[PDB]
Motif scaffolding. Structure first.
Motif, short mmCIF file in Angstrom:
data_model
loop_
_atom_site.label_atom_id
_atom_site.label_comp_id
_atom_site.label_asym_id
_atom_site.label_seq_id
_atom_site.Cartn_x
_atom_site.Cartn_y
_atom_site.Cartn_z
N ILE E 145 0.81 -1.08 0.00
CA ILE E 145 0.15 -0.08 -0.12
C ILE E 145 0.91 1.07 -0.01
N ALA E 146 1.02 1.94 -1.07
CA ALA E 146 1.75 3.00 -1.26
C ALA E 146 1.02 4.21 -1.46
N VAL E 147 1.75 5.56 -1.20
CA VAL E 147 1.47 6.65 -1.60
C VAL E 147 1.72 6.97 -3.37
N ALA E 148 0.58 7.46 -3.85
CA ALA E 148 0.79 7.57 -5.23
C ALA E 148 1.94 8.33 -5.54
N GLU E 149 2.61 8.11 -6.73
CA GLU E 149 3.93 8.60 -7.14
C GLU E 149 3.66 9.79 -7.43
N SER E 151 1.45 11.99 -6.12
CA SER E 151 0.97 12.57 -4.78
C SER E 151 2.24 12.86 -3.51
N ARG E 152 3.45 12.17 -4.23
CA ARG E 152 4.35 11.81 -3.06
C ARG E 152 5.08 13.35 -2.65
N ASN E 153 5.18 14.50 -3.28
CA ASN E 153 5.56 15.66 -2.80
C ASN E 153 4.57 16.45 -2.46
N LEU E 154 3.31 16.14 -2.15
CA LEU E 154 1.93 16.78 -1.46
C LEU E 154 2.89 17.10 -0.02
N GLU E 155 2.33 18.56 0.42
CA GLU E 155 2.45 19.05 1.66
C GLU E 155 1.96 18.16 2.61
N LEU E 156 0.93 18.02 2.82
CA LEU E 156 0.24 16.96 3.78
C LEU E 156 0.93 15.64 3.74
N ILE E 157 1.30 15.22 2.68
CA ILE E 157 1.80 13.85 2.71
C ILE E 157 3.46 13.93 3.21
N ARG E 158 4.08 14.93 2.80
CA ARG E 158 5.46 14.88 3.37
C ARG E 158 5.68 15.18 4.74
N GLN E 159 4.70 16.05 5.07
CA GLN E 159 4.67 16.17 6.74
C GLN E 159 4.23 14.97 7.40
N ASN E 160 3.23 14.29 6.91
CA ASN E 160 2.79 13.18 7.37
C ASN E 160 3.92 12.06 7.61
N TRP E 172 1.37 -6.08 12.77
CA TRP E 172 0.82 -6.60 11.49
C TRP E 172 1.22 -6.10 10.14
N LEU E 173 2.25 -4.93 10.28
CA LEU E 173 2.44 -4.12 9.31
C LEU E 173 3.69 -3.90 8.84
N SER E 174 4.16 -3.54 7.64
CA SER E 174 5.45 -3.15 7.47
C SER E 174 5.57 -1.80 7.05
N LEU E 175 6.62 -1.09 6.99
CA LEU E 175 6.66 0.37 6.79
C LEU E 175 7.96 0.57 6.13
N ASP E 176 7.99 1.20 4.83
CA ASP E 176 9.39 2.05 4.46
C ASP E 176 8.96 3.44 4.16
N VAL E 177 9.61 4.17 4.85
CA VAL E 177 9.36 5.54 5.02
C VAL E 177 9.78 6.35 3.84
N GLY E 179 10.34 5.19 0.78
CA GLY E 179 9.52 4.87 -0.38
C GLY E 179 7.94 5.04 -0.27
N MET E 180 7.56 5.75 0.81
CA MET E 180 6.24 5.75 1.24
C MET E 180 5.33 4.68 0.77
N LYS E 181 5.96 3.49 1.10
CA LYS E 181 5.07 2.37 0.88
C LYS E 181 5.12 1.38 2.20
N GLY E 182 4.12 0.47 2.34
CA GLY E 182 4.05 -0.14 3.40
C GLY E 182 3.40 -1.64 2.90
N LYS E 183 3.40 -2.60 3.92
CA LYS E 183 2.87 -4.01 3.39
C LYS E 183 1.93 -4.36 4.40
N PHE E 184 0.86 -4.87 4.06
CA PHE E 184 -0.17 -5.54 5.12
C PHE E 184 0.43 -6.93 5.21
#
Ligand SMILES: [Mg+2]
Ligand SMILES: [Mg+2]
Ligand SMILES: [Mg+2]
Ligand SMILES: [Mg+2]
Ligand SMILES: [Mg+2]
Ligand SMILES: [Mg+2]
Ligand SMILES: [Mg+2]
Ligand SMILES: [Mg+2]
Ligand SMILES: [Mg+2]
Ligand SMILES: [Mg+2]
Ligand SMILES: [Mg+2]
Ligand SMILES: [Mg+2]
Ligand SMILES: [Mg+2]
Ligand SMILES: [Mg+2]
Ligand SMILES: [Mg+2]
Ligand SMILES: [Mg+2]
Ligand SMILES: [Mg+2]
Ligand SMILES: [Mg+2]
Ligand SMILES: [Mg+2]
Ligand SMILES: [Mg+2]
Ligand SMILES: [Mg+2]
Ligand SMILES: [Mg+2]
Ligand SMILES: [Mg+2]
Ligand SMILES: [Mg+2]
Ligand SMILES: [Mg+2]
Ligand SMILES: [Mg+2]
Ligand SMILES: [Mg+2]
Ligand SMILES: [Mg+2]
Ligand SMILES: [Mg+2]
Ligand SMILES: [Mg+2]
Ligand SMILES: [Mg+2]
Ligand SMILES: [Mg+2]
Ligand SMILES: [Mg+2]
Ligand SMILES: [Mg+2]
Ligand SMILES: [Mg+2]
Ligand SMILES: [Mg+2]
Ligand SMILES: [Mg+2]
Ligand SMILES: [Mg+2]
Ligand SMILES: [Mg+2]
Ligand SMILES: [Mg+2]
Ligand SMILES: [Mg+2]
Ligand SMILES: [Mg+2]
Ligand SMILES: [Mg+2]
Ligand SMILES: [Mg+2]
Ligand SMILES: [Mg+2]
Ligand SMILES: [Mg+2]
Ligand SMILES: [Mg+2]
Ligand SMILES: [Mg+2]
Ligand SMILES: [Mg+2]
Ligand SMILES: [Mg+2]
Ligand SMILES: [Mg+2]
Ligand SMILES: [Mg+2]
Ligand SMILES: [Mg+2]
Ligand SMILES: [Mg+2]
Ligand SMILES: [Mg+2]
Ligand SMILES: [Mg+2]
Ligand SMILES: [Mg+2]
Ligand SMILES: [Mg+2]
Ligand SMILES: [Mg+2]
Ligand SMILES: [Mg+2]
Ligand SMILES: [Mg+2]
Ligand SMILES: [Mg+2]
Ligand SMILES: [Mg+2]
Ligand SMILES: [Mg+2]
Ligand SMILES: [Mg+2]
Ligand SMILES: [Mg+2]
Ligand SMILES: [Mg+2]
Ligand SMILES: [Mg+2]
Ligand SMILES: [Mg+2]
Ligand SMILES: [Mg+2]
Ligand SMILES: [Mg+2]
Ligand SMILES: [Mg+2]
Ligand SMILES: [Mg+2]
Ligand SMILES: [Mg+2]
Ligand SMILES: [Mg+2]
Ligand SMILES: [Mg+2]
Ligand SMILES: [Mg+2]
Ligand SMILES: [Mg+2]
Ligand SMILES: [Mg+2]
Ligand SMILES: [Mg+2]
Ligand SMILES: [Mg+2]
Ligand SMILES: [Mg+2]
Ligand SMILES: [Mg+2]
Ligand SMILES: [Mg+2]
Ligand SMILES: [Mg+2]
Ligand SMILES: [Mg+2]
Ligand SMILES: [Mg+2]
Ligand SMILES: [Mg+2]
Ligand SMILES: [Mg+2]
Ligand SMILES: [Mg+2]
Ligand SMILES: [Mg+2]
Ligand SMILES: [Mg+2]
Ligand SMILES: [Mg+2]
Ligand SMILES: [Mg+2]
Ligand SMILES: [Mg+2]
Ligand SMILES: [Mg+2]
Ligand SMILES: [Mg+2]
Ligand SMILES: [Mg+2]
Ligand SMILES: [Mg+2]
Ligand SMILES: [Mg+2]
Ligand SMILES: [Mg+2]
Ligand SMILES: [Mg+2]
Ligand SMILES: [Mg+2]
Ligand SMILES: [Mg+2]
Ligand SMILES: [Mg+2]
Ligand SMILES: [Mg+2]
Ligand SMILES: [Mg+2]
Ligand SMILES: [Mg+2]
Ligand SMILES: [Mg+2]
Ligand SMILES: [Mg+2]
Ligand SMILES: [Mg+2]
Ligand SMILES: [Mg+2]
Ligand SMILES: [Mg+2]
Ligand SMILES: [Mg+2]
Ligand SMILES: [Mg+2]
Ligand SMILES: [Mg+2]
Ligand SMILES: [Mg+2]
Ligand SMILES: [Mg+2]
Ligand SMILES: [Mg+2]
Ligand SMILES: [Mg+2]
Ligand SMILES: [Mg+2]
Ligand SMILES: [Mg+2]
Ligand SMILES: [Mg+2]
Ligand SMILES: [Mg+2]
Ligand SMILES: [Mg+2]
Ligand SMILES: [Mg+2]
Ligand SMILES: [Mg+2]
Ligand SMILES: [Mg+2]
Ligand SMILES: [Mg+2]
Ligand SMILES: [Mg+2]
Ligand SMILES: [Mg+2]
Ligand SMILES: [Mg+2]
Ligand SMILES: [Mg+2]
Ligand SMILES: [Mg+2]
Ligand SMILES: [Mg+2]
Ligand SMILES: [Mg+2]
Ligand SMILES: [Mg+2]
Ligand SMILES: [Mg+2]
Ligand SMILES: [Mg+2]
Ligand SMILES: [Mg+2]
Ligand SMILES: [Mg+2]
Ligand SMILES: [Mg+2]
Ligand SMILES: [Mg+2]
Ligand SMILES: [Mg+2]
Ligand SMILES: [Mg+2]
Ligand SMILES: [Mg+2]
Ligand SMILES: [Mg+2]
Ligand SMILES: [Mg+2]
Ligand SMILES: [Mg+2]
Ligand SMILES: [Mg+2]
Ligand SMILES: [Mg+2]
Ligand SMILES: [Mg+2]
Ligand SMILES: [Mg+2]
Ligand SMILES: [Mg+2]
Ligand SMILES: [Mg+2]
Ligand SMILES: [Mg+2]
Ligand SMILES: [Mg+2]
Ligand SMILES: [Mg+2]
Ligand SMILES: [Mg+2]
Ligand SMILES: [Mg+2]
Ligand SMILES: [Mg+2]
Ligand SMILES: [Mg+2]
Ligand SMILES: [Mg+2]
Ligand SMILES: [Mg+2]
Ligand SMILES: [Zn+2]
Lengths: 99, 124, 83, 138, 208
Positions: E145-149, E151-160, E172-177, E179-184
Motif C-alpha cells: 500500500i503506497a502513496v501515489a508517485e 502525490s508524493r511531494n504533497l505538503e500534507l503527505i510530506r509532513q505526515n 501486522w504491518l511493514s513500513l518503508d518511509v 518509499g512511502m510504501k507499506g505492506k499489510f
RNA sequence: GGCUAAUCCCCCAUGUGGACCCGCCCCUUGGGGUGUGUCCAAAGGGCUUUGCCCGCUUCCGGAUGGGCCCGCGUCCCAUCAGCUAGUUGGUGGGGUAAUGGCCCACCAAGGCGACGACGGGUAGCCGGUCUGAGAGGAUGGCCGGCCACAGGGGCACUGAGACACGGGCCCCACUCCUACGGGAGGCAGCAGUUAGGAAUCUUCCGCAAUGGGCGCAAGCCUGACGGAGCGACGCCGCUUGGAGGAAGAAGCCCUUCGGGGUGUAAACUCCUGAACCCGGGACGAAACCCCCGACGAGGGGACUGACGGUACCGGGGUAAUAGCGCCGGCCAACUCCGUGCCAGCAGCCGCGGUAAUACGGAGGGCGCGAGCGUUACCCGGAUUCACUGGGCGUAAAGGGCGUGUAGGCGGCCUGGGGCGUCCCAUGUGAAAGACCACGGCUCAACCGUGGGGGAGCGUGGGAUACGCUCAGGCUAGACG
RNA sequence: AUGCGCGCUAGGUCUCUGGGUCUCCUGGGGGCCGAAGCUAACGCGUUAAGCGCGCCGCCUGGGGAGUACGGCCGCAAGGC
C-alpha cells in the motif's frame, strides 16, 4: 423394471378380470409412525384362472382396458379368505355412516 | 393426542381474519367523503373526534379518521384511505392520509411532518 | 437438428459464453444437452477458451452441427486437427 | 401383557433407583438382557444376574449411586440421572447412521438395536450401522 | 455519507477517547479534557443505570464511530464475519482492520481515519502499483500500500511521513518511509489492536 | 372459358430393400429371422461439364425432440355421504404413429367410496424464494423446466409435426366499412393508447455481437436479441470535505442568575479537488468470405459496431445537497413554554379536568442517512395446533354408561423368509440458485471457473437386533 | 366435575368379603393419614392427580352462543 406388486383377489365378478387388493406400508412424513394403506388394482386374468382369495403377484403391463394396466403374474398363496372377508366386512360397514 | 390420533385427525392450522377490508390486499384505497362529522369517544375519554364516512373505490362505505389539528374536508371531497383504526372510537377502522387528494396537510405543523402530510418550511 | 453453439452467460457488457450441445429449437439461453467448453471473448483471463475436444468429436460423430463461431472456437482447440 | 416390555424395564429401573433400592427384578427376556449388559458395561448399573421368582425367570439389576452428601437432604446423586424410551410401539423410531444422536455432549449414551446387535451410539457409529433407537441414558 | 459533522461530541458520548481528529485528540484540547460528560443540556446530570440494550447499543456505536463506517457497511461486515470460519468478534475486527482507508491511517500516511478516507477517494493511494480510490476496498495480506508517485511531494503527505520517521507501526504491518510504501503482512488479532471495545458486546447486540 | 413449365400430379419398369396375408424357426405381449404369394421407389438443378457439387428414392441404424402408460407425492369444507349408464369388464370392429370404452355394435353386471368417493370452494406445477435454531410455516414475480390459453364456444384441413396467437370454417359478444345485398377485425408479440386502479417505462438505437428461419453462396428476414431511455423499486459503490481552530463569539435554549448548553460546531488558516473543461480513446471481432492446399486438415488474406467518442488513461479544476423517524414504558434519547377531558395523541398499557419527559412548538438528545417513515401482506416471536414441542380434578378440555365393528397396539423361547429397518455399490437427483475456494470488472453489487454436499426414487449386493410373516414349542396374560 | 387396560413406586390406621398354622398373615373391594414423587396452588399419593406403555374422547381468550343456517332424529316438547 415393470413394477410388480402383491395382493389378494377380492373380486371374481368380471370377465377375464380380477380385483386385486394391494396393501403397502410407509412412515408418516410428520408423525413418523408406519401407516398401512392399500388400493385395488384391476388385473388381467385372460384364462379366468385366478380365483377369489388367491394372493397374487401382479404386473405393470400394456394397457388392457380403461382401469386395466396390470396383468396377473403368478399365484403365490392360495386361499386366504381371511383377507377377503376382512375387506368384505369393511364394505359392509359402509352401509352405516349415512343419514 | 395419541400419535395414531394425530395420524388420523392431524392438527388444525389456524387462520387469522383481516383487520382491514380496503380489499385488494391494497395498502390504500381512494374514496369520496359522504359525511364529514364529529364523534364522541369511548368510555374512558372525551373529545370531539373528526371523521369522514367514505365511499371506497372498493365498493365499501367506511368511517375514516382525519388526524391532525386543522382540516379542510367536506361532503364531496375525495380522499385516500390508509388503514389503521381508532381505539377509543366506535367503528373507525382506517385513517385518512393527509396531503393526498382533497385532503390538505396540517398547516403550521413543524414536527412529525410526513405523518400529517406537510412540507418542510423554509427558514430565516 | 442438434447444434454445437454459444449460450450467453455473462452480465451486461460482461459476456461469457458456454459452448454447448443443444437442440436447435431451444431458447438460446435455455436448457441444453451438454456443456462442452467455455468462451470469454474479452479475454479477461489466461484461459478464455476451454474445449474438451473428446466430447466435441463425439457430438460431431452423431451429427450435431456447430455454428460458424462455435466451429471457429472448436477448431481453435483443434477438435478438427488431423495430425 | 405388558404393551412395551422394554419400557417396563426402563421404568422399573427408574422408580427403583429413585428410592435408592439396592436391586430390582424385571421379567426376563434375552433382549432385556442385552440392554442391561450395555448399561453394566457402561457403568450405569452394577451388573445384573439371571434369577428365579416363583419359578419364573427374571433378571435382577443391581443399582449404583453416588456418595452421601452434606447439608439437608444427604440423599446420593443418582448414577442414572435420566433414562427414557425413544422407539415405542405405535411410534417406531429408526435412525440411519448419520442420524444417530450424540447424547448429553458425549457424557450420555443411546442404545440402538441393529442387525449387528445391540450397541451404544459410539459403538454403532464405529460399526458404521444404524437401526432402531431404543432409549437414551445419562 | 458516513457520519460527517461535530465529532469530539462522539468522543464524549462514548465516554472514551476515540481518536477521530488525530493530533489534538492528542493535545490537552480533546474535550475529554474537562468535558468527559456527554453532549447536550443534560450532560452534567447524574446518569441512570443503563439497560442491557443500552449497554450493547453503546458498545457497538463505539466500535462503528472508531472506524467511521455507515451502519449498513458495518452490519454487512459483521454478518459477513458471522458467516466466516473462526471467532466472529475477532474476524469482524480483522475485516474492519482491512479497509483500505484504515490501512492508510494505520500506516501513518494519514493523520486520522477520515483523512485517510479523503486521501483514498482522491487517489493519492496506490495498492500494488495501481490507484485504488475505494475506501471500502479490502486489503489482503501481501498487498503493498503506497502513496501515489504523483502525490508524493504533497505538503500534507510530506509532513505526515516525516512524522512517521522513527515511529513504529502496527506489528501486522511493514513500513518503508523513504518509499512511502507499506505492506499489510497479516490479519490482526484482538490483542494486536487496543480498541476500547468489548467486541462480544457487539456480537450480542446484533444477536437480538 | 383458353394456353403452359417444373424438384407439381400420374402410369409402366428396375426391387438393394421394405409392407401385408399365411407357414415354419428363434425370442417372448406387436422383438428377430426365413419361405412362397401379392403390393411399393425416384427429380432435377449447378457448375472450374466425362467429374465434382447442392439435391432426389428405398432401407437399416444413430442422434435429437415427442406421444402414450404405471408407482408414489401434490389446498380447503363431511354444515358435501354416497357416486356410477360408456358406467365396469368381455368379444368383434372403427380410429391412431401407437395401447386404450378413445368410438361403435353386440354380451355380461359390473366399477368407485369414511385409506374421504360425489359435490362445493380455491389454484397453473416445479427448480427455487422468504422466513425459522430447526422442524416447520408462507410463497412460485423476474431467470430456467413443464403445462395451458391466444375475444368466448365448437371443428377440422394441410403437414414430420398443429386441431396451429400475427392460418381456415361455424356460432356468440363487440368495433369498423356498406350502394343494406353483404363485408373486415382480434397487442396475454415490441412500443404506444385508453379504461380500471394505491400503482408499474420509450410509439428509442442497432443486426456489430449470440441465437434463430431460408439460401451453394453472396446475402435476406429476425421488437429473439445486444444496447440505450424513464422510475431511490431493489442491491452495491461513492459525494456533500480534510487538518488546525477559544477555556471556549453572536444568536438561541436552560438557569439556583453564579452559570450550564448548542461546541471545534461556526468564524478564520492551511491542504485535498465531487462537479466541470481539454486531449487521447478501447475491449467485446473473427469468423462466414477470398487465397494456397483437396471445397478436407493445415497455412495465409480481407471486411465488419448499436452501445459510442462510451468505458478507461492523461491534463486542468471549484469546498461543493441533508434529510426523515423518534426522546412515558416495551425502546437508545429531557428540559422550558403553550394548552386545561379542550385541542390533540395512541401498537398495547394508556396520556389530556392548570405544574403534561405521553398533546403542540422550541432548545437539547437518540437513531438511520439519499434516504427516512407509513400502509398492506408473509414468516417470526407463537413451545398460542405443541413431530421436535402443550394439555383436560377445580383454569378451555374425559364422550352419561356399556357392547363391540373397522382400525391402532401385542408375553417367553426356537427356526425359515428378509417386507419394515439398516448397510455397500451404482444410476438419477439438469442448469441456475444455496455453500466453499480461486478469479474478472480500481472494490462491491454483478459475473466466471473449480469443488463439495444431498433427501428421495431405480438396480445389484449384504446384515438380521428390533418390527412383521410362516412354522414349531412354553405358561408368567386371557379364558375354562 | 378425575376414559379404559397393564406394569412399577415407603408405611400407618379403620372397614366390607373370602382363604390361612387366625398376635397377625394372604387376596379382592370401601375409607382416612401419609414416603418418594407430582401440582399454579389447593391438593393427589398402591382406590395417584407419581413413574411408564397401548388405545379412545376432548381442549385452543371472554361475550355473541349452545345462538343462526344446513342436515338428521322426534307425535310434540325438544334433541344431535
Ligand atoms: Mg373369474
Ligand atoms: Mg380390451
Ligand atoms: Mg404373464
Ligand atoms: Mg352401496
Ligand atoms: Mg356419521
Ligand atoms: Mg381521559
Ligand atoms: Mg372541493
Ligand atoms: Mg398497525
Ligand atoms: Mg407525535
Ligand atoms: Mg423443443
Ligand atoms: Mg486481466
Ligand atoms: Mg487457447
Ligand atoms: Mg476428427
Ligand atoms: Mg435412508
Ligand atoms: Mg463466525
Ligand atoms: Mg499510529
Ligand atoms: Mg501478524
Ligand atoms: Mg487506535
Ligand atoms: Mg478490552
Ligand atoms: Mg441473527
Ligand atoms: Mg429472532
Ligand atoms: Mg379451365
Ligand atoms: Mg393464350
Ligand atoms: Mg410398379
Ligand atoms: Mg429381395
Ligand atoms: Mg396385432
Ligand atoms: Mg415427389
Ligand atoms: Mg418424369
Ligand atoms: Mg426419446
Ligand atoms: Mg351417457
Ligand atoms: Mg359376445
Ligand atoms: Mg378393441
Ligand atoms: Mg373416432
Ligand atoms: Mg396426425
Ligand atoms: Mg360394428
Ligand atoms: Mg354400447
Ligand atoms: Mg385407498
Ligand atoms: Mg373457478
Ligand atoms: Mg385460476
Ligand atoms: Mg395455493
Ligand atoms: Mg410452530
Ligand atoms: Mg423446508
Ligand atoms: Mg405450493
Ligand atoms: Mg409479469
Ligand atoms: Mg417479461
Ligand atoms: Mg417462467
Ligand atoms: Mg380457449
Ligand atoms: Mg385482448
Ligand atoms: Mg365473451
Ligand atoms: Mg376460439
Ligand atoms: Mg412440412
Ligand atoms: Mg393450442
Ligand atoms: Mg396479434
Ligand atoms: Mg404464427
Ligand atoms: Mg358469417
Ligand atoms: Mg379501419
Ligand atoms: Mg390492428
Ligand atoms: Mg375472419
Ligand atoms: Mg403492452
Ligand atoms: Mg384513472
Ligand atoms: Mg422496459
Ligand atoms: Mg430498426
Ligand atoms: Mg446478425
Ligand atoms: Mg447468424
Ligand atoms: Mg442452411
Ligand atoms: Mg459463388
Ligand atoms: Mg437476392
Ligand atoms: Mg420486415
Ligand atoms: Mg432488452
Ligand atoms: Mg414515479
Ligand atoms: Mg417521486
Ligand atoms: Mg445506496
Ligand atoms: Mg495548520
Ligand atoms: Mg498546534
Ligand atoms: Mg463553553
Ligand atoms: Mg456563545
Ligand atoms: Mg438569554
Ligand atoms: Mg443559589
Ligand atoms: Mg454564556
Ligand atoms: Mg471542522
Ligand atoms: Mg487561524
Ligand atoms: Mg492533480
Ligand atoms: Mg487549488
Ligand atoms: Mg472527454
Ligand atoms: Mg474490436
Ligand atoms: Mg481484434
Ligand atoms: Mg455476414
Ligand atoms: Mg490471397
Ligand atoms: Mg486448387
Ligand atoms: Mg478453391
Ligand atoms: Mg481455415
Ligand atoms: Mg485462418
Ligand atoms: Mg459512433
Ligand atoms: Mg467511433
Ligand atoms: Mg495521453
Ligand atoms: Mg482526472
Ligand atoms: Mg464549506
Ligand atoms: Mg472549508
Ligand atoms: Mg443529522
Ligand atoms: Mg410506565
Ligand atoms: Mg429499536
Ligand atoms: Mg428509556
Ligand atoms: Mg385550544
Ligand atoms: Mg398557564
Ligand atoms: Mg403544563
Ligand atoms: Mg395532573
Ligand atoms: Mg414534552
Ligand atoms: Mg408517544
Ligand atoms: Mg413532544
Ligand atoms: Mg428538534
Ligand atoms: Mg438532529
Ligand atoms: Mg422502505
Ligand atoms: Mg407479499
Ligand atoms: Mg403473523
Ligand atoms: Mg420457535
Ligand atoms: Mg392464536
Ligand atoms: Mg399454551
Ligand atoms: Mg406433542
Ligand atoms: Mg394448553
Ligand atoms: Mg389422560
Ligand atoms: Mg373438594
Ligand atoms: Mg373445567
Ligand atoms: Mg364419566
Ligand atoms: Mg371394550
Ligand atoms: Mg381386531
Ligand atoms: Mg401375533
Ligand atoms: Mg414379540
Ligand atoms: Mg398385527
Ligand atoms: Mg429369524
Ligand atoms: Mg431387505
Ligand atoms: Mg457389503
Ligand atoms: Mg451417489
Ligand atoms: Mg435424469
Ligand atoms: Mg443417492
Ligand atoms: Mg443444483
Ligand atoms: Mg452469486
Ligand atoms: Mg449447506
Ligand atoms: Mg477480486
Ligand atoms: Mg442441502
Ligand atoms: Mg435436495
Ligand atoms: Mg434388495
Ligand atoms: Mg439369516
Ligand atoms: Mg405360535
Ligand atoms: Mg399345563
Ligand atoms: Mg417396601
Ligand atoms: Mg378369618
Ligand atoms: Mg385395601
Ligand atoms: Mg392424602
Ligand atoms: Mg412430599
Ligand atoms: Mg406431570
Ligand atoms: Mg409444596
Ligand atoms: Mg397393588
Ligand atoms: Mg393400605
Ligand atoms: Mg374407584
Ligand atoms: Mg394406574
Ligand atoms: Mg393433574
Ligand atoms: Mg389459541
Ligand atoms: Mg371470540
Ligand atoms: Mg340447549
Ligand atoms: Mg349452513
Ligand atoms: Mg334447525
Ligand atoms: Mg342423529
Ligand atoms: Mg320431521
Ligand atoms: Mg331446552
Ligand atoms: Zn477527540
Amino acid at each position: 423394471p415393470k413394477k410388480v406388486l402383491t395382493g389378494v383377489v377380492v373380486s371374481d365378478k368380471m370377465q377375464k378380470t380380477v380385483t386385486v387388493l394391494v396393501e403397502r406400508q410407509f412412515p408418516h412424513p410428520l408423525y413418523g409412525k408406519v401407516i398401512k394403506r392399500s388400493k385395488k388394482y384391476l388385473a388381467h386374468d385372460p384364462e379366468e384362472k385366478y380365483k377369489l382369495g388367491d394372493v397374487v403377484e401382479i404386473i405393470e403391463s400394456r394397457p388392457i382396458s380403461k382401469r386395466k394396466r396390470f396383468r396377473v403374474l403368478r399365484l403365490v398363496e392360495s386361499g386366504r379368505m381371511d383377507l377377503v372377508e376382512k375387506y368384505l366386512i369393511r364394505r359392509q360397514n359402509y352401509e352405516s355412516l349415512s343419514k | 393426542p395419541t400419535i395414531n390420533q394425530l395420524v388420523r385427525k392431524g392438527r388444525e392450522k389456524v387462520r387469522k381474519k383481516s383487520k382491514v377490508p380496503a380489499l385488494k390486499g391494497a395498502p390504500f384505497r381512494r374514496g369520496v367523503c359522504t359525511v364529514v362529522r364529529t364523534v364522541t369517544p369511548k368510555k374512558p375519554n372525551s373529545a370531539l373526534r373528526k371523521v369522514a364516512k367514505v365511499r371506497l373505490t372498493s365498493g365499501y362505505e367506511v368511517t375514516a379518521y382525519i388526524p391532525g389539528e386543522g382540516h379542510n374536508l367536506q361532503e364531496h371531497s375525495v380522499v385516500l384511505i390508509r388503514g389503521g383504526r381508532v381505539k377509543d372510537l366506535w367503528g373507525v377502522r382506517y385513517h385518512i392520509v393527509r396531503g393526498v387528494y382533497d385532503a390538505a396537510g396540517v398547516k403550521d405543523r413543524k414536527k412529525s411532518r410526513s405523518k400529517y402530510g406537510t412540507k418542510k418550511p423554509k427558514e430565516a | 437438428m442438434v447444434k454445437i453453439r454459444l449460450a450467453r452467460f455473462g452480465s451486461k457488457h460482461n459476456p461469457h459464453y458456454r459452448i454447448v450441445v443443444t437442440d436447435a429449437r431451444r431458447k438460446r439461453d435455455g436448457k441444453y444437452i451438454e456443456k462442452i467448453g467455455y468462451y470469454d471473448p474479452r479475454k479477461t483471463t489466461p484461459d478464455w477458451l476451454k474445449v474438451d475436444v473428446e466430447r466435441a468429436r463425439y457430438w460431431l460423430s452423431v451429427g450435431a452441427q456447430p455454428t460458424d463461431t462455435a466451429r471457429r472456437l472448436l477448431r481453435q482447440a483443434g477438435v478438427f486437427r488431423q495430425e | 401383557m405388558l404393551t412395551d416390555p422394554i419400557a417396563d424395564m426402563l421404568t422399573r429401573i427408574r422408580n427403583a433407583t429413585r428410592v435408592y433400592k439396592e436391586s430390582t427384578d424385571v421379567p426376563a427376556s434375552r433382549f432385556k438382557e442385552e440392554i442391561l449388559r450395555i448399561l453394566a458395561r457402561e457403568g450405569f448399573i452394577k451388573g445384573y444376574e439371571r434369577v428365579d421368582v416363583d419359578g419364573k425367570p427374571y433378571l435382577r439389576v443391581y443399582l449404583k449411586y453416588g456418595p452421601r452428601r452434606q447439608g439437608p437432604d444427604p440423599r446420593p446423586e443418582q448414577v442414572i440421572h435420566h433414562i427414557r424410551r425413544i422407539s415405542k410401539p405405535g411410534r417406531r423410531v429408526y435412525v440411519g447412521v448419520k442420524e444417530i444422536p450424540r447424547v448429553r455432549r458425549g457424557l450420555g449414551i443411546a442404545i440402538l438395536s441393529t442387525s449387528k446387535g445391540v450397541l451404544t451410539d459410539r459403538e454403532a457409529r464405529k460399526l458404521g450401522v444404524g437401526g432402531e433407537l431404543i432409549c437414551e441414558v445419562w | 455519507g458516513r457520519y460527517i459533522g461535530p465529532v469530539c461530541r462522539l468522543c464524549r458520548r462514548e465516554g472514551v477517547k476515540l481518536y477521530l481528529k488525530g493530533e489534538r485528540c492528542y493535545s490537552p484540547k480533546c474535550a475529554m479534557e474537562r468535558r468527559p460528560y456527554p453532549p447536550g443540556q443534560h450532560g452534567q446530570k447524574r446518569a441512570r443505570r443503563p439497560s442491557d440494550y443500552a449497554v450493547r447499543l453503546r458498545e457497538k456505536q463505539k466500535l462503528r464511530r472508531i472506524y467511521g463506517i455507515s451502519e449498513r457497511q458495518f452490519r454487512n461486515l459483521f454478518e459477513e464475519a458471522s458467516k466466516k470460519k473462526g471467532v466472529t468478534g475477532s474476524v469482524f475486527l480483522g475485516l474492519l482492520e482491512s479497509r483500505l482507508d484504515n490501512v492508510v491511517y494505520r500506516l501513518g500516511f494519514a493523520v486520522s481515519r477520515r483523512q485517510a478516507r479523503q486521501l483514498v477517494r482522491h487517489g493519492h493511494i496506490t495498492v500494488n502499483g495501481r490507484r485504488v480510490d475505494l475506501p471500502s476496498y479490502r486489503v489482503r495480506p501481501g498487498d503493498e500500500i503506497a502513496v501515489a508517485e504523483k502525490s508524493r511531494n504533497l505538503e500534507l503527505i510530506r509532513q505526515n511521513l516525516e512524522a512517521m520517521k522513527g515511529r513504529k507501526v502496527g506489528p501486522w504491518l511493514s513500513l518503508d518511509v523513504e518509499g512511502m510504501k507499506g505492506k499489510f503482512l497479516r490479519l490482526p488479532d484482538r490483542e494486536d489492536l487496543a480498541l476500547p471495545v468489548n467486541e462480544q458486546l457487539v456480537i450480542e447486540f446484533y444477536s437480538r
